């Protein structure tokens, strides 16, 4: 079976199957990492998802064993490029597009070059 495929576009059924049903308990480590970070909720009412969580590195450097910052080590953001759907309007008329959004998922600690 195949639908009538129209030109210069795509058919996007939105029935999103979550083939990845985790079953691997994750936690709030953002506070514990050597490169700690804060989370910010992002709301774009004309996007799907409307809510995107971006992370922000707490410092320029990595926190040590005593609890103070170490500048000889750098705190770097680790990014994941994902897809979002974008709703646009000219007026009553509504268009749909796919956008690539780079999301900062958290911070890791790297030795400089």
């Amino acid at each position: 079976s195949c639908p009538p495929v129209p030109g210069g576009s795509m058919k996007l059924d939105i029935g999103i199957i979550n083939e990845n049903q985790r079953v691997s308990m994750s936690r709030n480590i953002e506070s514990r990492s050597t490169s700690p970070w804060n989370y910010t909720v992002t709301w774009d009412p004309n996007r799907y998802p409307s809510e995107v969580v971006q992370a922000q590195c707490r410092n320029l450097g990595c926190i040590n064993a005593q609890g103070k910052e170490d500048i000889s080590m750098n705190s770097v953001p680790i990014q994941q490029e994902t897809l979002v759907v974008r709703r646009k309007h000219q007026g009553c008329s509504v268009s749909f597009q796919l956008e690539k959004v780079l999301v900062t998922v958290g911070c890791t600690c790297v030795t400089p070059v």
Binding site: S1, C2, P3, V5, P6, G8, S9, M10, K11, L12, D13, I14, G15, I16, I17, N18, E19, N20, R22, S24, S26, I29, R32, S33, T34, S35, C62, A65, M73, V76, I78, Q80, T82, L83, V84, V85, R86, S95, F96, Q97, L98, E99, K100, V103, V105, G106, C107, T108, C109, V110, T111
Partner: protein, 100 residues
């Protein structure tokens, strides 16, 4: 179902205290076809000398992402949206130790 316009608008794994190895998650129907799923190299973190400090944990960062699968599996531009779990990187945390 929505008609969408066809135009879809660094080396930390080796450098990081908590380093990782990228694994080939290949799929001919799904877009992106290949996704690199990062898996932690050690249980612990790499210390100031270059050895593993087992008094530290190397845990991975995980994310939900939007991918598109070809639906039907053969058709050209007919896709169905998919949600998946991806291990992106590893960070190094301090473990929760309970004393006596």
């Amino acid at each position: 179902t929505v008609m969408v316009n066809l135009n879809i608008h660094s080396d930390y794994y080796n450098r990081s205290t908590s380093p990782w190895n990228l694994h080939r998650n290949e799929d001919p129907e799904r877009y992106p076809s290949v996704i690199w799923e990062a898996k932690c190299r050690h249980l612990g973190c790499i210390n100031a000398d270059g050895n593993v400090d087992y008094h530290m944990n190397s845990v991975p960062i995980q994310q939900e992402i939007l991918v598109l699968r070809r639906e039907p599996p053969h058709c050209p531009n007919s896709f169905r949206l998919e949600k998946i779990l991806v291990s992106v990187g590893c960070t190094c945390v301090t473990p929760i130790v309970h004393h006596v």
